[PDB]
């Protein structure tokens, strides 16, 4: 009746955060393999190492340091029992990162942080009772009546989610303001090597731990606030033929992954029908018109997507620069990359946000096969 | 600008389910101690004998049956590992049991499946990737661009958090019709009994199996479609000194859960303190004049908030009568008792789905100690 706010969703401020111990991938084949004991394993370092080269990953943070892993032997073996060696890190470290990089958000917001009306927390790295918006709440210190939405365990598609939550809760509720934090870390992941699983060895070449916030309110404020993005529309559909391709189990061992099909190619085969149910209803056809974020699951994927629709150099440049300087933070991934094209478009003197385009789309790919498309719109200086 | 529709979220469809192997308590105290092989276990068998009868509760709906209790001995265990056991059980029956609940739902209805736009399932009972809201939509069989929230391990809250959910998506997109799945099986729990924490063994003597699902839509179309309860208010606040008041880990022998303080006085020293400010700002003071549907936690809560209040005996009537046939279904249990309001004020003749009354209030209580607060609207006949 009147508790309904007037404009759309609005991304007001951005902060990130990340790990203080920094891992570089042209060390990592060796150390990898002198912390998990694998020595023996001779090509299979062989196969490591090149892959380790795919990547297009230079540094990566990583809250289990070299000091920690040799206490806990059962994380540096492939399947060995240690989820409670893991979460027990992860269920305190997550909101942890989370608070850092929230609070950077609040900061460059300017505003009370009891102005903050919902709390969006994501994360695929452990699960708890009370959660990690519990544990962020208190942490920084929220109104003990803020209404706060908990994705637990949803995957590197996460990153649109939060988004396309964020947008109906600001939008259908006036003056309210959301808090999104994406955070995770890559310790219920980490494990040894297998010559008769590979694939567990790929997320061993790409994940990195990172944390993402965001405030996302309607009505901006003049003088006070100062708006970045507006979301204008957030779909999320399943691929045909991939009920499979990338799968997730908890274990008593830890989180255990899998890729099964050829996810580069399964997303560019569709990512075509997603593009045009978003912008043929604004007569929009060329895709170098847009601005573009996409989640990096891995270097394929950027390069078989930029192929599949011949998009220039410049459009990925800000997807391919987190993806290099942070590996692949999976949900708060996204997020990062929308703070790094800001920051660029404001140093680079572009007359707007988006590169100094107006229309933009974000992309997040994970279990599913599922795909959420956010298009987004800039705003000017 | 033209997306959100005009009217207030309405909840149009209840449907139910629940596993088929009943338990009754009268049997209880004696066939759990007889299953884990705990005999010699003398007065903790009555100590627990006089916690089903404690109860109010006659049967509950177990898919851990007898005859699968005997080839996984370690969920009969009280500390003996069995996430996986547990997992590969429940990760494939919360959303079958969620089907049988769904369809239930969708045949009341009565419209075109393809019509659902988004869809909410939330659940405790194990973690998966790709969740439990994929294995849904295939089992149903919905358009592969639904969108979805996957609410995993969030407590014996999430029955107001997924109204409160479905309130906004519903209101902000026009014409959107939102199917929500609550579904809980019993096993993550199922443990077995030790004097040395006793903590462990109130969950055992209340908690069930079930499954609950609903039609959620804003601008209800006449001639199809029939309103049943509106949504009007939703507020999730956090008790203060409740730091551990109810807690969950997820280790790998189960999903462990704790009592360390007297959640029904947690509850009642704060009730009021929710209750004037739902219906302060529509003039109502005596809480008799609504009608009531809590969560059943136990028979303390609904007898300590009874007294707190000097509430009527039928206020609370339907909210144990499903307490008496099902026991606590977790988040799944809020929907059922809504369901068996509105086919009570039918049968009974009432002039309104609300138990002859028009407004009324919905509580759920869960890990924080968070409390969810629901403000429902009854409709005619």
């Known amino acids: 009746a009147a508790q309904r706010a007037r404009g759309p969703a609005t991304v007001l401020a951005i902060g990130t955060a990340a790990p203080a111990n920094v891992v570089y991938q042209a060390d990592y084949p060796d150390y990898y393999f002198r912390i998990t004991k694998s020595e023996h394993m001779t090509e299979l370092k062989e196969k490591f190492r090149r892959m380790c080269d795919k990547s297009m990953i230079t540094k990566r943070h990583m809250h289990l340091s070299e000091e920690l892993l040799k206490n806990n032997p059962d994380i540096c073996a492939y399947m060995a029992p240690s989820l409670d060696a893991r979460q027990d890190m992860v269920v305190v470290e997550v909101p942890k990162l989370g608070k850092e990089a929230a609070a950077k958000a609040i900061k460059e917001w300017g ?18 009772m009370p959660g990690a918006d519990f544990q962020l709440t208190k942490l920084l210190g929220l109104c003990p009546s803020v209404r706060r939405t908990m994705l637990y365990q949803q995957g590197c ?25 994406c955070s995770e870390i890559t310790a219920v992941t980490f494990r040894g090597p297998s010559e008769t699983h590979l694939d567990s060895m790929v997320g061993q070449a790409l994940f ?12 901006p404020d003049p003088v006070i606030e100062r708006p970045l993005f507006q979301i204008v529309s957030a779909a999320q559909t399943i691929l045909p033929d991939s009920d499979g391709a990338i799968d997730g189990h908890l274990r008593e061992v830890g989180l255990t992954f899998h890729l099964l099909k050829d996810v580069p190619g399964l997303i560019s085969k569709n990512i075509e029908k997603s593009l045009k149910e978003a912008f043929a209803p604004l007569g929009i056809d060329d895709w170098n018109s ?12 950027l390069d078989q997507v930029e192929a599949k629709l011949r998009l220039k150099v410049e459009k990925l440049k800000t997807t391919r620069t987190v993806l290099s300087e942070y590996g692949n933070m999976s949900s708060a991934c996204v997020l990062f990359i929308l703070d790094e094209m800001r920051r660029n478009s404001m140093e680079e003197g572009k007359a707007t946000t988006g590169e100094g385009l107006h229309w933009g789309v974000l992309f997040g790919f994970g279990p599913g096969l599922t795909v959420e498309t956010v298009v987004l719109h800039s705003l000017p200086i």
Do not use: M, Q, Y
């Open 111 to 128: 505003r009370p942080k009891s102005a903050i009306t919902h709390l969006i927390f994501c994360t695929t790295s452990g699960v708890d």
């Open 157 to 181: 598609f996460a990153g649109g989610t939060v988004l396309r939550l964020a947008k109906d809760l600001a939008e259908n509720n006036a003056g309210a303001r959301v808090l999104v934090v």
């Open 208 to 219: 990195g731990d990172g944390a993402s916030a965001i405030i996302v309110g309607a009505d």
């Open 290 to 301: 847009i601005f573009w974020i996409v989640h990096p699951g891995g270097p394929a994927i």
